[PDB]
Amino acid sequence: MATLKVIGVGGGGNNAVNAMIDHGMNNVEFIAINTDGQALNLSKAESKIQIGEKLTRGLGAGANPEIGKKAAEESREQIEDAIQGADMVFVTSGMGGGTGTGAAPVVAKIAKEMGALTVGVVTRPFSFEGRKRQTQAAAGVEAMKAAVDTLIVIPNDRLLDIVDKSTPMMEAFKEADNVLRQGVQGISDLIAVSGEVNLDFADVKTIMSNQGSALMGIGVSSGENRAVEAAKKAISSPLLETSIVGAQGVLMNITGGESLSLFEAQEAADIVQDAADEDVNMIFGTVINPELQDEIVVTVIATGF
Ligand SMILES: Nc1nc2c(ncn2[C@@H]2O[C@H](COP(=O)(O)OP(=O)(O)O)[C@@H](O)[C@H]2O)c(=O)[nH]1
Numbered sequence: 001m002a003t004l005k006v007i008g009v010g011g012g013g014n015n016a017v018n019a020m021i022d023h024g025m026n027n028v029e030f031i032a033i034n035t036d037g038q039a040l041n042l043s044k045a046e047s048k049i050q051i052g053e054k055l056t057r058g059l060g061a062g063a064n065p066e067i068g069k070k071a072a073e074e075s076r077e078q079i080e081d082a083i084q085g086a087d088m089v090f091v092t093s094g095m096g097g098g099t100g101t102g103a104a105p106v107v108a109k110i111a112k113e114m115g116a117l118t119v120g121v122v123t124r125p126f127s128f129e130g131r132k133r134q135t136q137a138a139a140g141v142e143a144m145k146a147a148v149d150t151l152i153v154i155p156n157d158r159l160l161d162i163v164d165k166s167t168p169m170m171e172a173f174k175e176a177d178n179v180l181r182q183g184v185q186g187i188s189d190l191i192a193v194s195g196e197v198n199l200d201f202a203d204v205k206t207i208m209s210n211q212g213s214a215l216m217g218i219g220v221s222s223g224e225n226r227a228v229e230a231a232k233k234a235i236s237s238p239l240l241e242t243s244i245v246g247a248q249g250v251l252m253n254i255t256g257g258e259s260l261s262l263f264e265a266q267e268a269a270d271i272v273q274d275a276a277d278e279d280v281n282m283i284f285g286t287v288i289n290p291e292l293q294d295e296i297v298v299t300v301i302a303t304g305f
Pocket residue numbers: 009010011012013015016061063093094095096097098099100101123124125126129133156173174176177180
């Protein structure tokens with residue numbers, strides 16, 4: 001049974017990890033990382049690492065990624081001790097500030113160099129945060145690409161396509177927390193659900209390793225043609241920056257409220273295989289979530305770009 005750990009890096013990442021904890025992701029261990037001592041005290045993770053004590057004197061990184069980077073490097077041993085034993089590590093962070101932008105790539109490289117399957121799940125800032133955050137965030141994503149095995153980037157501006165028009169700013173960040181939770185949960189569910197192995201870990205690791213940027217989409221449908229419709233939605237999800245056309249590796253999970261037939265799963269898989277336009281190493285699993293009625297959920301991770 002794989003040891004999964006989820007690490008928040010910086011304020012946005014730790015706020016997302018707090019939402020993961022509240023909501024009850026089970027069978028994973030949570031860690032929070034920050035340069036800002038006071039922000040770090042409000043985090044709900046049982047393992048907390050204040051990085052760059054000497055450098056920052058605990059006062060944060062002031063939106064400077066070079067400071068977040070040197071803080072994580074200063075604290076490398078402590079981060080490694082907190083990671084030791086993980087088979088898989090998620091690094092979650094909002095790109096664009098100092099700590100997550102700078103430290104999250106150091107943290108990822110540390111995990112990867114312990115042999116863990118290292119998955120980044122990160123956001124690009126909303127446009128209201130300004131062109132400067134957006135620029136810093138883009139350098140952050142480029143550094144994260146090299147540091148992880150697989151990177152999932154979610155643009156926060158795309159969240160606005162799937163929330164009510166009346167959504168205030170505070171709720172839009174709560175939505176950002178929820179999407180990071182869903183991306184982490186959805187990838188976690190490829191490994192194990194309800195404490196039971198789903199896809200073979202070694203084969204997941206093979207597909208997700210040393211890939212850099214990858215693509216993740218989740219789609220939902222019901223009634224007639226539900227499997228195919230859910231699959232089409234997954235691969236055209238509003239959160240996707242690219243299409244899956246070309247992908248050399250695909251991991252797929254299909255979730256229903258009763259054990260799904262292989263036939264039906266395979267119809268959804270055929271949509272994803274076709275849309276690829278090239279011949280994939282594709283692996284899929286099926287899971288049961290009792291709370292579902294007639295809805296099927298299709299989760300797709302595509303890599304090899
Ligand atoms: N998910 C989430 N993202 C946030 C929140 N607050 C800010 N962000 C995003 O995270 C980015 C980095 O800010 P922050 O995490 O505060 O900076 P850092 O602590 O220096 O990395 C921001 O540009 C926002 O896009 C939040 O509460 N939740």
